[PDB]
């Protein structure tokens, strides 16, 4: 009985400390009770810090955090102290601005110290909870309940008189900022890092995940809920709309803007370069850029959604029986091989297809579908576009959406370039030491802001694309490409997905800058497609089909971007690329040749030797070879697997898939890749009234491709009946007959 005795004495001591911090001053008679500090209360703040140090850190326990959380130290002690300090300092600043050296604080240093210690406890207690492997069983047991207590913390921070603690935190930051750059000690810049970390804790708190034990078999009741919410906390309090509202009301956005825009001239950038990027990522991990531009209007889209629902409901009730359930109708169908098969239904009486769909659906044997089990959640990472569903939408309001649009616009127009340059300065030396979290957030920050500036420049001509021009430096090229390559070779798949998104948006930015101006563009397209990266982008779709839907959609968008940026050089032929030479490329140099090159391009001979070596590995690639390398059967397998989810996707992704199917089936002219039966079943499902809408623009090119596909199919089967077997099975590899199977000789 040592464990529960230690737990109850620890809870008793935290209860005594929480009573010893302060009181609401019920002795004074004010209609709101003003919070009064207790006697010897700064020592209590140091005791909470000492308890969180000695127990929570080295001993690998989280009992102190819940012992604090159940006694409401953050809710009832730290926040009233910080808000009282904020209100008193604001009133004193007003009275000192009107008349200086009148009505001072009695003990301002004490109040500043206890405010700083309260902010330290806010950062230390709202830290993001990650539970990796080999951790203690106490943390594994306590993780979900501590995530719920952190959700209560985020709601209480954002909701207490619209978040005056954010104003307290920025006041603690401008205590540092008012000091000159030369007179600032590193402790003051560490206080600035504390404030930026507090804002990243406020943004970064998200609802937890529901973990189940799979040792026992799942019963017949199954999962009834996956809700992981505290009682008073709803999904609206946690959501980003309240974050944007509380940040705009308390001028957090102007604080972040004025530290981002003067990061190099005013602040020591190495202290706050990483928490600033973490803050930007924690805004932009769950925001889609297409939904931020909306292009009675809510009722307009509502009326269109009810028309779509009415058409789908009509197509559903076509299959629904007109009579009741007990009105028994039995139908015996025969094949031309004489047999009797019985189905039970009323709608299935008249049409053959509903009856055959009944006969397919009456079976109770289901094949195994193996699952990856979503191992991304095992790593310590937030929910983002790599984890959310493709159909997930963030529902910004008018004012919150306008404030977020203004903040992101001023961020890009002020200091996206300086922040990106500072981060790619820092990470290019810390590349081999960063864990997956910084790689994922760097690639997502880069890709999100590049995509948002691309979309803003496409929508409006007032914005300049050169505001993300520092995305196009060689250092960011090297960093993104090396991150993607190191993610692939170590078989890390989250960073591979983030780098795939970043490379797709990098190619989109290069294509936009090339279409704008027709130069350094040939240099950078030679730089990205150098080394073995064409083979990397070629074999990324071959391994796509095993992983999740978002990985496969990124494979779609990356391969579409690769083929679009490489089809621009089909006639221009400018495809000189640094390649990796394998066997001996040694050449006996000639110093006369070296000196005449020195006269030619005005070079020193050491870097001319470098140029002479680098000219030997230069090769040229064929775009037809790039297409024919992309036409492997697992690429078609993963694209057919992506087209299976055609209900969830929008028009753009299936437009990309059918554009690549036009590339396979019309241009490249080998057609046996698409002569498989899963595509035929999927095309029947898409062209049915239950599938794609007739008013949607997707069904037009789906129908056109299916018409041309069945025309070539009937041509191939009329010329050769043996392909009646070939639709069932994967294509054949024997060289004596495989040419006739693939091309028809």
């Amino acid at each position: 009985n040592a464990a529960d005795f230690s737990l109850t004495v620890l809870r008793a001591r935290i209860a005594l400390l929480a009573t010893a911090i302060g009181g609401p001053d019920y002795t004074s008679q004010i209609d709101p009770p003003p919070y009064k500090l207790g006697d010897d209360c700064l020592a209590c703040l140091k005791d909470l810090k000492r308890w969180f140090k000695l127990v929570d850190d080295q001993q690998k326990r989280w009992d102190v955090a819940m012992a604090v959380a159940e006694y409401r130290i953050l809710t009832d002690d730290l926040l009233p102290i910080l808000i009282d300090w904020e209100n008193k300092c604001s009133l004193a600043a007003k009275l000192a601005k009107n008349n200086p050296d009148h009505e001072e604080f009695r003990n301002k240093a004490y109040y500043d110290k206890i405010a700083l210690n309260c902010l330290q406890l806010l950062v230390l207690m709202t830290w993001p909870l990650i539970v990796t492997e080999q951790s203690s069983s106490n943390q594994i047991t306590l993780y979900g309940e501590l995530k719920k207590h952190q959700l209560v913390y985020k709601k209480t921070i954002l909701s207490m008189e619209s978040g005056k603690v954010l104003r307290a935190a920025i006041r603690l930051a401008l205590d540092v900022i008012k000091i000159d750059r030369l007179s600032r000690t590193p402790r003051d810049n560490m206080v600035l890092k504390l404030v930026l970390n507090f804002f990243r804790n406020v943004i970064a708190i998200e609802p937890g995940e529901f973990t189940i034990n799979t040792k026992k078999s799942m019963p017949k009741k199954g999962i009834t809920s996956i809700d992981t919410l505290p009682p008073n906390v709803s999904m609206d309090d946690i959501s980003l709309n309240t974050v944007i509202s509380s940040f705009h009301k308390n001028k957090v956005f102007g604080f972040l803007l004025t530290l981002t825009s003067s990061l190099s001239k005013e602040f020591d950038q190495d202290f706050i370069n990483i928490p600033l990027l973490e803050i930007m990522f924690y805004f932009t991990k769950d925001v889609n850029q297409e939904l931020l531009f909306p292009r009675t209007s809510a009722g307009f889209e509502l009326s269109k959604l009810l028309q779509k629902e009415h058409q789908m409901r009509k197509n559903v009730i076509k299959h629904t029986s007109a009579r009741h359930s007990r009105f028994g109708g039995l139908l015996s169908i025969q094949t031309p091989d004489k047999t009797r098969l019985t189905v039970s239904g009323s709608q299935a009486l008249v049409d053959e297809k509903i009856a055959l769909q009944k006969l397919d659906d009456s079976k109770k044997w289901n094949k195994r579908i193996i699952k990856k089990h979503q191992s991304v959640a095992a790593e310590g990472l937030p929910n983002s576009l790599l984890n959310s569903q493709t159909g997930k939408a963030i529902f910004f309001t008018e004012s919150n959406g306008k404030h977020f649009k203004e903040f992101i616009n001023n961020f890009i127009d002020s200091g996206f370039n300086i922040l990106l340059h500072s981060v790619t300065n820092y990470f290019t030396t810390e590349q081999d030491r960063m864990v997956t979290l910084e790689q994922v957030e760097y690639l997502l920050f880069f890709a999100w802001f590049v995509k948002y500036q691309l979309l803003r420049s496409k929508i409006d001509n007032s914005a300049d694309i050169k505001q993300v021009s520092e995305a196009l430096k060689e250092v960011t090229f090297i960093l993104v490409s090396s991150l993607l390559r190191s993610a692939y070779d170590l078989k890390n798949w989250t960073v591979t997905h983030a780098g795939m998104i970043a490379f797709n948006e990098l190619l989109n930015l290069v294509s936009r800058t090339k279409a704008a101006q027709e130069t350094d563009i040939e240099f950078i397209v030679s730089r990205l497609f150098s080394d073995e990266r064409i083979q990397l982008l070629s074999n990324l779709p071959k391994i796509g089909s095993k992983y999740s839907l978002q990985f496969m959609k990124s494979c779609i968008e990356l391969t579409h971007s690769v083929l679009k940026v490489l089809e621009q050089y089909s006639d221009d032929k400018t495809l000189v690329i640094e390649g990796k030479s394998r066997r001996q490329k040694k050449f006996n140099i000639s110093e006369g040749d070296i000196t005449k090159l020195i006269e030619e391009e005005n070079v020193d001979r050491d870097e001319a030797l470098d140029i002479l070596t680098s000219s030997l590995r230069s090769i040229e690639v064929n775009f037809q070879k790039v297409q024919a390398n992309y036409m492997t059967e697992p690429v078609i397998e993963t694209y057919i697997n992506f087209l299976e989810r055609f209900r969830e996707l929008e028009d753009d992704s299936i437009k990309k898939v059918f554009s690549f199917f036009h590339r396979v089936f019309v241009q490249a002219k080998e057609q046996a890749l698409l002569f498989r039966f899963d595509l035929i079943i999927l095309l029947r499902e898409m062209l049915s009234p239950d599938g794609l809408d007739r008013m949607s623009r997707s069904r037009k090119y789906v129908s056109q491709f299916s018409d041309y596909f069945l025309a070539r199919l009937k041509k191939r089967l009329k010329k050769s009946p043996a392909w009646f077997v070939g639709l069932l099975f994967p294509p054949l590899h024997n060289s004596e007959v495989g040419f006739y199977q693939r091309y028809g000789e």
């Binding site: 601005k97 401008l174 900022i177 604080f255 803007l257 003067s262 001023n410 002020s414």
Partner: peptide, 20 residues
Amino acid sequence: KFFSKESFLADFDDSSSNED
């Protein structure tokens, strides 16, 4: 579009004064 820190201090003090 450079954002000044002294402008942020002035806006902080002014919105402390009247808040508009």
